[PDB]
Ligand binder design. Structure first.
Ligand SMILES: Nc1ncnc2c1ncn2[C@@H]1O[C@H](COP(=O)(O)OS(=O)(=O)O)[C@@H](O)[C@H]1O
Ligand SMILES: Nc1ncnc2c1ncn2[C@@H]1O[C@H](COP(=O)(O)OS(=O)(=O)O)[C@@H](O)[C@H]1O
Ligand SMILES: Nc1ncnc2c1ncn2[C@@H]1O[C@H](COP(=O)(O)OS(=O)(=O)O)[C@@H](O)[C@H]1O
Ligand SMILES: Nc1ncnc2c1ncn2[C@@H]1O[C@H](COP(=O)(O)OS(=O)(=O)O)[C@@H](O)[C@H]1O
Ligand SMILES: [Mg+2]
Lengths: 200, 193
């Protein structure tokens, strides 16, 4: 017996109030990829760039989320489904609020990344899937603690070893972090945000 | 990026004002009414905010929860964690959930205060008979007809706050009277200029 309550404030007014030299630019930048591939690195520099150009944003990192909102979830397929589902719902509120939301979660199931997109596109919010792509071995020698414990059978169902990572087929962007610079990665994301009319 | 750097790019006129106004009270007490009219004020005055309403949130993030003691605990736990992210992002976050249990509201507080973010517990306080009279959604009559079990105030409990930052007597005040009480507490804590 739950029935929806409408807001009094439109997106257009929100974009007037949040962003200086306004225009509503609420969206979500969804980073996806193996552990140690470069998602958090890339998302924190993107957040830095954005704040330095007067564009309000927040970063939701799986690791951070997973000690607060999702502290009660593990790494079974079903928990990762629910991990991703909740954060898709959270990110949708941030883009609806007027902010560029940046997420950095492994998010290893295509079905779940597509659901996250539909949550946004349904609500007429732009959703940018960015594949952060570093070869497994590169991600592994970058590690500290986890890959080692996982090869020893102390972390069961670890993405890339024991559990599969499902690659996006045709994302908005692929970031080759083994051959690409941190600033260069960030610039590519900005270039995308330029065309897609988020950054002036 | 630091909170200080956020407050110079988020605000329409500078200074970090991230915080959570947390409304608690009976069904029909006036939570949604106040929060949305409060959301209207803050926006028209150049202050970015966002309302998280228990009914809307239960359509999305919290759609896999019902009204058991434990589910109400999880409902409130999740939105407290979300509200601390909006706060930390520099927005004034307005939540309006029944949040019937004092243990869970104190937990939502601790979540915030342990991140050094302001938390204002606002008791929206109309007695049951008043809320029942209004019965805006037909829920009280349905509850008393035996069509809804464990309804707050009838077959489950509401636990009143012990040290709220603000009580609003919606039975003796009008919407705007109530909105202004809120703003003046916000003025007091340098959230609103
Ligand atoms: N272009 C790049 N992008 C991201 N990380 C890089 C890059 N080049 C080198 N690195 C290194 O790779 C590591 C990236 O790890 P994280 O950002 O922590 O990965 S994450 O995907 O699990 O979030 C950092 O230690 C960083 O110094
Ligand atoms: N079994 C595991 N698989 C992958 N990551 C794990 C596992 N156990 C712990 N972790 C830690 O959790 C982080 C990833 O969490 P998420 O991005 O939240 O995962 S996701 O698959 O559900 O999206 C990793 O970077 C790693 O530090
Ligand atoms: N001062 C007041 N503040 C808020 N609501 C009031 C006030 N006076 C009367 N009301 C009325 O009481 C009803 C409260 O219902 P809701 O706002 O929907 O309450 S809620 O707590 O269940 O969210 C509304 O129809 C509202 O117009
Ligand atoms: N058994 C019930 N008790 C109270 N509210 C209910 C119940 N069933 C449906 N509702 C509806 O759901 C709303 C309560 O949602 P919340 O604010 O999210 O409650 S809370 O107790 O878990 O915080 C009420 O406004 C009412 O519309
Ligand atoms: Mg309500």
């Amino acid at each position: 017996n739950v029935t929806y309550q409408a807001h009094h404030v439109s997106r257009n007014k929100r974009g007037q109030v949040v962003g200086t030299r306004g225009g509503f630019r609420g969206c979500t930048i969804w980073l996806t990829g193996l552990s140690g591939a470069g998602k958090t690195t890339v998302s924190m520099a993107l957040e830095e760039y954005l704040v330095c150009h007067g564009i309000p944003c927040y970063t939701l990192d799986g690791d951070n989320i997973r000690q607060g909102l999702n502290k009660n979830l593990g790494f079974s397929p079903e928990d990762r489904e629910e991990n991703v589902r909740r954060i898709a719902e959270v990110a949708k509120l941030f883009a609806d609020a007027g902010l560029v939301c940046i997420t950095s979660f492994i998010s290893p199931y295509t079905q779940d990344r597509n659901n996250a997109r539909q949550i946004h596109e349904g609500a007429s919010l732009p959703f940018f899937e960015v594949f952060v792509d570093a070869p497994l071995h590169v991600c592994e020698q970058r590690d500290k603690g986890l890959y080692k414990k996982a090869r020893a059978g102390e972390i069961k169902g670890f993405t890339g070893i024991d559990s599969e990572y499902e690659k996006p087929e045709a994302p908005e962007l692929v970031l080759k972090t083994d051959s690409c610079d941190v600033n260069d990665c960030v610039q590519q994301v900005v270039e995308l945000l330029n065309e897609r009319d988020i950054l002036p």
